[PDB]
Amino acid sequence: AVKKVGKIIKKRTKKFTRFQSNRFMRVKPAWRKPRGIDCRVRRRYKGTNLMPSIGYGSNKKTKFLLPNNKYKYVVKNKEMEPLIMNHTKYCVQIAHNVSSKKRKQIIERAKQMNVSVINAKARL
Amino acid sequence: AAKKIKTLKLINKKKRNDLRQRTLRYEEEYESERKKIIELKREARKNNCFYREAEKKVVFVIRLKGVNKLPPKVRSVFRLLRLLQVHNGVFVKVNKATKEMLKIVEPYVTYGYPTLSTVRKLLYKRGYVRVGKVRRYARKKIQDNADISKHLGKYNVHGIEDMVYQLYTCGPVFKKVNNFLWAFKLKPPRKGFKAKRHAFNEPRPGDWGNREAHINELINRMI
Amino acid sequence: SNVSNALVWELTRKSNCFIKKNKAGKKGVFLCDPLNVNYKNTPSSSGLVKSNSTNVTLKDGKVVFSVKVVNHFKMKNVEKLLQQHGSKNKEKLLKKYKRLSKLY
Amino acid sequence: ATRFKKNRKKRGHVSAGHGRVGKHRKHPGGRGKAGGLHHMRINFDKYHPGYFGKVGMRHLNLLKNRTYCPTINVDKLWGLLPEEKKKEFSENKDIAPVIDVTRKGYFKVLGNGKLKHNQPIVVKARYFSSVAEKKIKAVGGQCILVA
Amino acid sequence: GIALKNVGRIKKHGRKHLVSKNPYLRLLVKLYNFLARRTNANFNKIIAKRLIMPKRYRPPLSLSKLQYHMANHPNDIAVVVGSITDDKRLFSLKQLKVCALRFTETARKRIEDAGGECLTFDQLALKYPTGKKCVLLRGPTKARTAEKHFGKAPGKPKSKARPYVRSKGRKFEKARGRRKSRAYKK
Amino acid sequence: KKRLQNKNSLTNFAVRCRLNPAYKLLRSLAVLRMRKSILEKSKNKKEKRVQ
RNA sequence: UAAAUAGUACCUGAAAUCGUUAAGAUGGAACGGAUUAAGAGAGAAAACAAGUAAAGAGGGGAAU
RNA sequence: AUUUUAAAAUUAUUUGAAUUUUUCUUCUUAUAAUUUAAGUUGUUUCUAUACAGUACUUUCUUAACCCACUCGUCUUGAAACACGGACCAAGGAGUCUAGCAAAUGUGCAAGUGUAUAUGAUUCUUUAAACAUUUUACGCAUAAUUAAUGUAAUAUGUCCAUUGUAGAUUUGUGCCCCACUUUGCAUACAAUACCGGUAAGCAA
RNA sequence: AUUUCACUCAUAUUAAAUAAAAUAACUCCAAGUGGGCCAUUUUUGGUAAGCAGAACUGGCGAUGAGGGAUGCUCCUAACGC
RNA sequence: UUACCGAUACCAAGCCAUAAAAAGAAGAAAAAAUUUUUUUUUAGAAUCUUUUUAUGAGUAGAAAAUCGUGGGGU
C-alpha cells in the first residue's frame, strides 16, 4: 500500500525480491529480470512476485528528499564549506571510515553551523 | 506601446456584442423551425395530404466494440472516420456516399439524429478542442473563446453558440468544425446497454444499428 | 583571441578539480571555487567564469576576503571593503559573512 | 576499449544476440567462399557478376615498370607553376612559361580542360594526345618532344 | 488500447543533438539555434540545422564553383557550411566574399591576394543576422565515392553501381554476365 | 499557461456566462416565464382545448 | 603477551550442515503474491518548543 | 517578479435605453470592492506541555479473506507420465589478430601518411617524445579494350553544356501570400565528348 | 513534337466525400527469420479423424486481465503506478 | 420486464517515463515578536529550466541511459 507522510508521497514499499528466491538458497534476494520462456513472472500471472517497472517512480518534485524534507550529503574530513548557504536543504552524514577525533571535530563544527547530522552517535 | 491593450479591449467588446446578436438570431431560428414543423403537420392532417420531414443531415455516432478481431476494411474505415477508442463519438455529415461507407461499419457502431439539447450538453460538458499547430494539436478543453477565435474565427464563427448552430443545422462549415473538435470521450451508461451482440431493430433486445431519434436518450447516460 | 568567459564554461562544466558530486543523494551537486558566493555549479555565478567577482570564505581559522585580480585582505571593515570593491549579491555576501563568522 | 562492445549489453540473455531457434553454429553455410555455383550462387550473381570465367590473353612477366606513365590533364598546367609567376606571365605579352613536366614527375599530357585564350605555353613531355596538341596549338602554344 | 500508427507517438528523423564534441562548434550552434529560436528568419534555422549535419554532408566547395555561382550577382556574400578547397584548375579569381567553417592555407592566400576577406560565422552573425545579402551554398553531397556502391545492386539490369573489387585488372570481375560471349550480359 | 481546474461549463454560472454572452438574458427570460400566476392557466385550460 | 575466541587443523573464518537457548506455528505437502491485524525488537534527522534572564564548563576573533 | 491581469459575475451608486413589462429583467457611461472569477480555505481540539513508552514510524514472526502447478530448455504445443538440476562456495563462455566495407568524431585537403631508416649535451622513468637540405613509395587525381595502345566540349571566352521543378537572394505590392531576379544540393531527363564494338567510307 | 510569348482555368472549403493524411519519401548498415498451428466461412482425398492439403480474414505463437467450474486459440477486452 | 453485482477495458483526478509541443543566454515577499530585530528563500545548470498534450504489452531482435569489478593516469 502507498504510504503518505506529510508531503513526500511514496507509492511502494517492500523492496522487491527475486522470483524463486524463497525455496532456493543459491538465489540471493537481489532482484533480477528473469528471462526464461514459460517463466510465469514474464507472463505476469495473477498475483505472483510482481516485477518493478517505471510507473512506481516517485515524483521528481520530491524524489530524492529524505523524511527530513532535506537531501542528504556525505562528508569526510572538513568539507563543510559548500554547506553554509543551503543549511535548510542539505543534511550531512559522516562517512563510515572516519575516526573518532575527526568525527568529533566535524560534529562540533556542524552543531554550531546548525545543520542536522544523521549518525551523530557513531563509534562513541 | 500601451494603446494596444485598450484596442484589444474594444476588439473583445465588439466580438462580445456581435456574438450576442448572433445567438439571438440563432434562438429565433430554432423556435421558427419548431413552429413551422408543427403548423405544417397540422395543415397536412387538416387536408388530405401527407408531410414528411427530411433527414436531419447530421448524425452522431459511437463505437461499441474493442480493437482486436476486426476486418481490415472495418479498421480502415474506423481510422478514416476517427473512432479510435471504444467509447469515442463523432458527428458526421449525411451524404449517400457517407451513409454507404457507414453501411460497412453498422454492426460495430450506433448512430442517430442529434436533437438540440444533447448537442449543447455535449459541447459544453465533454467538449474538447485541438489548440496548437497543425499535426501538434495537444487537445485542450474549451473554457474560453480566445483559441476558437484564433484558429476558427476567420470564417466568422468565433464563439460557442456559433458552433452550436453550425452543428445542429447543416451549414457552410463542417470540414473545419469537425476537424477542430476532438473526438468526444464518453462515459459508460448510467444503467447499461441492452445487448452489444444483437441489432437494435431485431425483435430480440439488442443495440447495434440505426437508432434515429432515440440516440439522445442513451447520450443522456453516455455523458 | 582564443578564450572567453563563455568559452571556459564549456571546458570546466565537466572536467574540473573543484566540482563535488553527491553520491548518496543524487540531487546534490556543488562547486568549490574560492570565488563563489554560492556553491551552485552555474556559469552565471562561478568564480572562474565571471569577468570579475568576489565572495567571503574561510582559510585555516580566519575569514579571508578576495576580489577578482585576486587580491587577498583581512564586520564594519567587511562592509567598508565590500563597498570599496562593489559592483542582491551585496547583501547576500554580507549575510554569508555574518553566518560564517560564528563558526570556529 | 572492451566494455563498448555490443556483447557487453546482452550478458543476461541466454542467446547472446545470436538467435535462439536457429542457434549459433560453427560455419553454417560452409567455410570460405564455398557456395559458388552450387547454393550461394545467387549472391555472386547479384553482387559480383563477372567473377567467374577467364577472359583475355596472357602477359607472362608484365614488369609493370615499363608501361608506367602518370597522367596530367592540360588545364592543370598553369596550376603547376606558382601563382606569382602565373601573374607575371599573364601580365607580359612577350614571355611564355616552359614546363618540363619530367621535373615534376609527370609523363603524359591529356586534353581535358580549358586553357586561357590568347596565351602561348611551351610544354615538354614524353607523350602527348591529339586533342591536347590541338588545344595547345590553338592558342599559340607549342608541343616539344623530350626523352 | 487505441488504433494509432506507432501507438500515437510522433517520430521524427534526423539529429536531435550534435554528437560532435568540439567546444567552439558547440558554442557556435548554441548561438545560431538561439538566433533561429528568437528570430523568424528561415536563414538562421537552415544554417543551424546545417551546422549539425555529419562530416559527409558538409562537403568541400571549390573556389571555381563558388565564383561561378556568384557570377550572377557580385555584391552578395556566400555562406557555405563546410570548408572551401582551393582548385589549381582555376586561373584567376575576382573579389569574392565568403563565409565557411574551415579553409586551406593555399585558398586563404589566394583569396587574400584576390582582395576579399574570410568571414567566420561569428562575423556573419554580428554583421548580417537576418540573412540579408547572403546566398547559401553547399558542395556536391552525393559525388563522394561511397555513393558509387549505392542504388541498384551491381548486377541489376541497367544498374550503374561500382562493385567492390581488389583491383581492376583483366581477371577481376570481367568475364561472366558482363559480356555476351560468356553467358548473358548485365 | 498552467492548466487549472477546468470549471464545469454546465452549472458554474460565472464560467457559463463567460462562454455564452447571452445566458443571463436567457435565464432571466426563463425566470420571468416561470414566475407567472396560476389563475391565468386555470381559466385558459379550456380556452386552449375547446379551440 | 596488547589479545590464548592468536594454543601448532595456529592471519579473517561466510555457505551448505549441525548443536543449544528462547518465541511461535503445527488436521495429507511446505515456501509465496497482494491487504491487514496482533505480538516482539529496535528508533528521534518533521514527529512540538526558536529566543528571553541567571550560573557551570569551555571556547574563539576584532579593538589597542 | 512584467495574462492569478483583462474582462466574467455579485453587491452598492450612477448612464442612457430597452423589452418579454420588472425585487435573480437585460444591454453599458463611469466608481469601490467581493468571487460563483483566477485547482481548499478557515475554526476547535489531540499529538502535547515529553525526550523513549503500550503512543508514534519501521522491520521481523505468526495468523486471517483472495489468488498462486518446479524452474531452465528444444518445441505449434511444458507443470507435465518430455530432458538436467540433493545441497553449498570459488572458477566458467562472442575474445584477439590480418583485411575490407559502412556509420560516427578529428586533422589536413588536390594532396595526403612520414616506412624502413637517419640526429640528438633525450638516454632512472625514456622499449617515448622531439626532428626529417628544393620527385621513395602506397592510396587519389582519368577512363577504357583481350591487346599493340588510345585517352573527356574547344579557343569562340577566366562563357565554366541545356531543360523541369527545387533551397536560398534582390525588390514590388521590419513580420504572410501573389508578381520579376538569382537556380544550392538533388531528382527526372536531354545534349555533347573519350575509350570499345558495330555499320558506311576508306591511302 | 518542341521552345518563347500571348490570354486564363474553382483556389475566399480547397475541379466528389472523409481523413491524429508529412508518424511521410529516400538512402545506407545490420540481427532474427526461413519446421507453424487454431477458429467462422469456401473447399480437395479419404467413411471418418483432435487426419492429410489449400483459400479471404482474425488470432495463437510473441499475451496476460474478467467470464466459459476447469482449457495455448471461445466471448468481453489487450496491460505504466 | 425492471433492479442489480461484475475488469489491469471506459470516464474524472493525481504521479512516473517517452515522444512531441509552447517558451527562456535579473527583482524583495511573508510571518513572529516589538517603527527595530529574528525567522525561510531571493532561482538562469541547454543531452538544462518552466509549462501543455498524448501515449504507455511484448519472445527472438536492436539501440540509449545506466550500476557495479580487477587495474591505470589525473
Side-chain angles (χ1 to χ4, degrees), chain A residues 4-63:
Chain A
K4 185 46 189 165
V5 165
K7 314 307 285 289
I8 172 172
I9 184 167
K10 279 200 187 178
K11 289 208 309 298
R12 178 66 149 155
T13 58
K14 282 159 58 79
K15 307 305 145 168
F16 302 158
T17 176
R18 195 162 147 197
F19 171 58
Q20 287 289 340
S21 69
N22 302 138
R23 45 181 173 265
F24 273 131
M25 152 56 78
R26 52 190 194 239
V27 174
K28 299 174 185 54
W31 153 262
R32 322 270 187 177
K33 177 185 183 80
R35 300 303 207 269
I37 291 302
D38 51 333
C39 49
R40 176 167 329 271
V41 171
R42 220 186 67 249
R43 282 165 172 260
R44 306 186 209 169
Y45 283 160
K46 178 175 53 201
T48 304
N49 315 86
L50 74 164
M51 65 182 179
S53 49
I54 183 60
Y56 285 97
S58 44
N59 45 0
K60 44 196 166 292
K61 282 201 194 303
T62 307
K63 180 169 169 65

Side-chain angles (χ1 to χ4, degrees), chain C residues 21 23 47 84:
Chain C
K21 293 180 181 179
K23 193 172 184 178
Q84 271 298 323

Side-chain angles (χ1 to χ4, degrees), chain A residues 69-84:
Chain A
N69 281 336
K70 182 156 304 200
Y71 307 100
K72 67 184 289 184
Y73 171 46
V74 190
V75 68
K76 292 178 174 65
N77 53 1
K78 62 93 178 177
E79 192 171 354
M80 301 315 218
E81 293 103 295
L83 197 67
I84 304 166

Side-chain angles (χ1 to χ4, degrees), chain B residues 12-148:
Chain B
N12 270 325
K13 175 183 178 298
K14 292 300 304 303
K15 292 258 174 151
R16 284 290 312 284
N17 289 142
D18 282 357
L19 182 49
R20 180 64 50 76
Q21 260 176 315
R22 293 188 167 95
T23 191
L24 280 186
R25 272 95 170 100
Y26 292 161
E27 280 300 329
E28 153 75 20
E29 190 159 348
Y30 294 128
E31 65 183 1
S32 166
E33 206 172 291
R34 270 179 302 277
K35 301 315 203 220
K36 294 292 107 174
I37 193 154
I38 291 171
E39 56 86 11
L40 280 173
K41 273 195 261 204
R42 264 183 191 156
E43 152 66 31
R45 303 294 294 280
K46 287 192 284 288
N47 279 309
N48 266 274
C49 55
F50 300 146
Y51 177 53
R52 83 291 186 277
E53 163 52 38
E55 52 276 20
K56 279 303 185 181
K57 308 176 296 187
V58 287
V59 171
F60 182 34
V61 69
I62 300 162
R63 174 162 166 153
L64 277 300
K65 278 195 72 66
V67 60
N68 308 328
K69 293 201 173 193
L70 301 170
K73 192 173 289 190
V74 166
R75 185 193 287 112
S76 59
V77 174
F78 269 117
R79 200 260 322 288
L80 200 57
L81 273 161
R82 203 184 32 187
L83 277 296
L84 277 68
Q85 279 319 90
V86 310
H87 283 98
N88 287 358
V90 298
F91 297 151
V92 286
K93 192 196 302 185
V94 167
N95 173 269
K96 70 182 190 62
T98 310
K99 185 184 288 185
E100 176 56 36
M101 66 182 180
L102 191 151
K103 178 188 269 192
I104 78 172
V105 66
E106 276 191 357
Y108 310 105
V109 299
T110 291
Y111 74 108
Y113 299 173
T115 70
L116 171 63
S117 277
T118 187
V119 71
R120 174 172 306 176
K121 292 179 183 179
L122 258 186
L123 280 176
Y124 292 174
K125 159 69 63 167
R126 290 295 176 160
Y128 283 88
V129 165
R130 302 161 153 181
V131 168
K133 188 162 61 173
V134 57
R135 309 298 291 186
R136 284 85 170 93
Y137 298 109
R139 160 208 168 206
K140 211 166 193 179
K141 185 164 252 198
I142 182 166
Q143 279 304 288
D144 201 272
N145 296 284
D147 55 4
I148 206 169

Side-chain angles (χ1 to χ4, degrees), chain F residues 1 3-4 8 10 12-14 18-20 22 25-27 30-31 33-36 38-39 41 44-45 47-48 51:
Chain F
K1 216 51 156 179
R3 158 184 160 261
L4 278 299
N8 187 321
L10 185 65
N12 178 290
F13 190 81
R18 184 172 68 192
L19 285 184
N20 184 351
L25 159 77
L26 283 189
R27 181 159 178 285
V31 173
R33 281 178 92 219
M34 191 175 38
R35 279 252 309 290
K36 299 307 291 181
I38 46 173
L39 156 70
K41 77 165 164 63
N44 289 319
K45 65 203 174 200
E47 316 185 13
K48 292 198 185 176
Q51 278 68 243

Side-chain angles (χ1 to χ4, degrees), chain C residues 41-52:
Chain C
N41 171 24
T42 55
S44 293
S45 85
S46 288
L48 73 165
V49 72
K50 301 293 285 185
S51 60
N52 284 109

Side-chain angles (χ1 to χ4, degrees), chain E residues 51-147:
Chain E
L51 288 175
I52 310 171
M53 322 205 88
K55 184 259 186 182
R56 83 191 167 117
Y57 283 161
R58 39 186 202 265
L61 184 61
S62 296
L63 270 300
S64 292
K65 295 305 258 203
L66 182 65
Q67 189 274 331
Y68 158 74
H69 207 267
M70 310 295 248
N72 316 102
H73 35 78
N75 300 125
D76 302 325
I77 295 90
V79 288
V80 296
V81 188
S83 69
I84 47 179
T85 182
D86 189 358
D87 195 353
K88 304 291 192 58
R89 300 171 306 186
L90 186 56
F91 203 98
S92 81
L93 191 151
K94 43 178 72 198
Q95 265 311 106
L96 196 56
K97 320 190 74 182
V98 302
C99 173
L101 202 79
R102 308 306 278 273
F103 287 74
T104 297
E105 300 300 335
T106 71
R108 202 169 276 283
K109 167 186 195 216
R110 183 75 91 85
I111 193 157
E112 295 152 323
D113 299 354
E117 67 273 18
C118 298
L119 279 77
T120 55
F121 293 97
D122 56 351
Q123 324 280 17
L124 170 74
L126 185 134
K127 281 142 188 87
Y128 325 117
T130 184
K132 191 158 299 186
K133 312 156 62 54
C134 287
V135 285
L136 178 49
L137 318 165
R138 52 174 145 200
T141 73
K142 307 297 285 185
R144 178 252 320 276
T145 69
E147 282 64 13

Side-chain angles (χ1 to χ4, degrees), chain D residues 21-60:
Chain D
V21 162
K23 301 203 146 301
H24 188 195
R25 283 316 213 284
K26 313 193 275 185
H27 302 257
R31 284 192 186 259
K33 304 188 288 179
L37 276 296
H38 302 346
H39 68 96
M40 271 155 88
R41 194 185 70 189
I42 201 153
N43 175 32
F44 297 116
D45 207 359
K46 194 183 170 174
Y47 289 164
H48 318 96
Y51 179 52
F52 289 90
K54 85 165 175 279
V55 165
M57 48 191 211
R58 285 156 64 227
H59 206 302
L60 277 296

